[model samples]
Target: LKPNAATRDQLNIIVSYPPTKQLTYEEQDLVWKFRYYLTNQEKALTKFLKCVNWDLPQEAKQALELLGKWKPMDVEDSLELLSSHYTNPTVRRYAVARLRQADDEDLLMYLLQLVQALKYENFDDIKNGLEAEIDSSQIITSPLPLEQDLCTFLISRACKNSTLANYLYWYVIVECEDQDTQQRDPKTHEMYLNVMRRFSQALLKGDKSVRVMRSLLAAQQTFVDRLVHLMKAVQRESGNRKKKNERLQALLGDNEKMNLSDVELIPLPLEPQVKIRGIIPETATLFKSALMPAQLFFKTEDGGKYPVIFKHGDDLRQDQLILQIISLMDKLLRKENLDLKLTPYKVLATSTKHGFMQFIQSVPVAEVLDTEGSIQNFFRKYAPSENGPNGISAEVMDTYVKSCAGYCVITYILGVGDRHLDNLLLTKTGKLFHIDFGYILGRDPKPLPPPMKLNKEMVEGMGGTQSEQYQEFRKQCYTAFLHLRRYSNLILNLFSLMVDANIPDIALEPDKTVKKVQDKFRLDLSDEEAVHYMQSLIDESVHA
Candidate 1:
């Protein structure tokens, strides 16, 4: 029978299309309308059949036939039909990829069902086709590894290449070494197995990065193994995954992945064989040991320390000094009754010339400064001046200033100096944290008169004025310092705990050095005199 005018018009539109563009506008429109009618008409087989282009539109006709023969009850059946028998390989791949991105829980079940369907019908053919396509030696050039998203793309591709998949699996499981002892951590063995399973599955089907999968997998396995080991060593130990799991569950609820097993309990090889030494072991050991004694002191009962402490001598380098400062800060903050808290600093250990080695945490504040985006982003969000005289914005600025003041006061008590714009971090939630205590001790080589003063740049960066905002800022600073002053004797008592714990001092006599600073800064003075004097200096600076 002769077709209708609409059908003739659609045919003219489809036939006039460029061959390079696989699907003509009319064909796409017809497919859409046909699918719509099938949904509404609830079993219009003829309408669906009419949508098929049976002539020179060879590829679209095959796709339409495959869809017509299959019922897409869920994502799985849809994915199988799209992936296995669609006339165009590109269309098949796109459909499968889209199914993978679907949020429906049944999508995974659908994928499994697709696998079953493929296996049931000419399984060998599907497997052989995939293998041949992957093995075909077509040299595909990729961008450099460091380029943006290059690694991610390469990793995805590697997952699809059978040879590369096998290589990455073995590399991470057997070849990758722990940084601590150059051996593989038995803890990561299961993770390696899991990755292998995923890699194999992706290869059997096709992955987005299938063409260059091997090289990408090899590179990624090597890089990730090294990175994981290095970070563990840097953090001084393996992460507490159980604790992390608990925290995540508490925050995100049971709907999140359940971390039921004590994966970390998997014993690691004690021998130092597989390690790639990113940082020197001696340095890491020294920092760990130096901080160990003081850390115990903080956790001890009654904020008291036992006798028989480690001795400190001359010849400690700048790095060791920094470690010592951090160790001391840790002890002071964690001391019982005194009950202050601070973020732990990065501690590295280095050997010394004497029979005894030293641990130091004194990094130059300049080394850790974040002069670029971090500070600017923080100020723009929290303390913008354009908000008028009531700029304190009681809801936001008041809390932020108070937190910053607390940070400053605590840092001061720790004798921390060189806290410029960069060393402070204002988190999105408005908490203030001090990073880089490396310059906390007297090891700062900057030219200075005795006893050293707090970095002026730091004070000035907080709005540098005597306005209400500045006053509120200063009030927080004074409040923290005053609280520290009231408990000054108790604070000194807390320091004695570290001294007694046999913790090595960053300085020759840290207690004496602290005493000198206290004497110079008049930490022992009455609140009236000290607050008045500090407030006066702040007033003069603001006026100036």
Candidate 2:
């Protein structure tokens, strides 16, 4: 293991391999031996950790001993280690140490992932009356340093911020609710309650902070109550769109339950900090979808108005899950400096049947085609430029390409289905995004969907398949795919926790749920081969 020309050459070769490449037993042994030399290599953190044979006490001891000497990894790398596979307590503690470096906003962004990461933490015996155990001191009976540090960090940050507290409580409460119905492991439920009790105690000490949580729940209930009232009013109007709009307007004007007064402050469930002054009833319009989602605007606490879609009679839980994952992926990509211009808009499933979705001002690809003939034309219509490709502005083109590549890679991995020109929307600013999650996890109404949703219009929008833009698109796809593959375990762990929550497509095949996602990660492929594989898929999709 001492420094030598041959060893150095071999280490260089091994390090040159892609991050996702699996190490051979001999390679693992050699890497473990030379991990001292890799301290400066930030990219080598996961590699070195993966090489260690943690089952062997001596090797794990040596690695644990070396952990302190290694340089600190980025917080994203730390998050990757918190995945299920890295169950070694010391390793997780090291990750938590790195996680401590992140600020409150960053932590809040990843709070969902971190909460799900709890499933990976080890727990002790399931105690009865755990929910009633209001004492934070006795909640964490298990000596889980990872949870200890993580929960402490969350509590400390959330206690000072009502917004943080609101999200933290709901995130944990949602998990706690799942255990009674589907999760066989009561330990997880106990673990969640431990966190809940800890945070709840913190809230009580802060007085008005507890009221924020109460008001948060109340805000959603009131919003849904108003929606139910409007739905009843609209249901009676067996007339055209104009008649329906008139009915909704009349209800908002006459019915107290449907009317949102200017003085009434209700936080948007999708974004709790954005307190709305009242709903602008004149703008409420009903969509023709089966659930009949109402597009409504709210006067924000600020002078501005915000638009959101309120829906009833459908399980938005699946949509909620997918958007959460997308939002996490967006953060992951942004952290890595890969700004794919992804718009993972806000979605909140207030209950199983109904919730809120952030309404983006954008034209669907279907409407763009009907009016402008192509997505490119739509982009040019909004942002024309003389010194850019196809007369589309450079900024707009870049936005289009990045988002296209971003969604392509994401939708492919999630097995998002039922995509069409309709659900795929594009903003005037050139950001392309998908809506609706009626199908996912390899479930599709269509007999066979392409590997990803690369329709001709999108390719044309990127200036045709043979264009340089298309080449850039494929390259970004490969890069994004490989980057995500590094955290395949993390993604899979999140899915494993959700399998029991009964998100339609995943619940359809709960036994194979996590594996269904893992299959898309293509962990079996080497980086070199995966690039080729991704390229092939892109080409097939372009021509499909």
Local distance difference test values of all predictions, in order:
0.36, 0.75
Question: Runs in model 1 with CA error above 4 Å?
Answer: 1-393, 449-464, 500-505, 517-524, 537-544
Candidate 1, RMSD to the unseen true structure: 26.3
Candidate No. with top lDDT: 2
TM values, all candidates: 0.33, 0.75
Model 2, span 133-199: residue lDDT tens: 3322232222222344556666777777767765776666556656343247666767877776666
Candidate 1 residue lDDT tens string, 255-285? 2232211111111111111122122112121
Q: What are the RMSDs of all candidates, in order? A: 26.3, 6.2
Compute the lDDT of residue 271 as modeled in candidate 1.
10
After best superposition, candidate 2 residue 400: deviation in angstroms?
2.0
**Residue-level error in angstroms, candidate 1, position 356:** 23
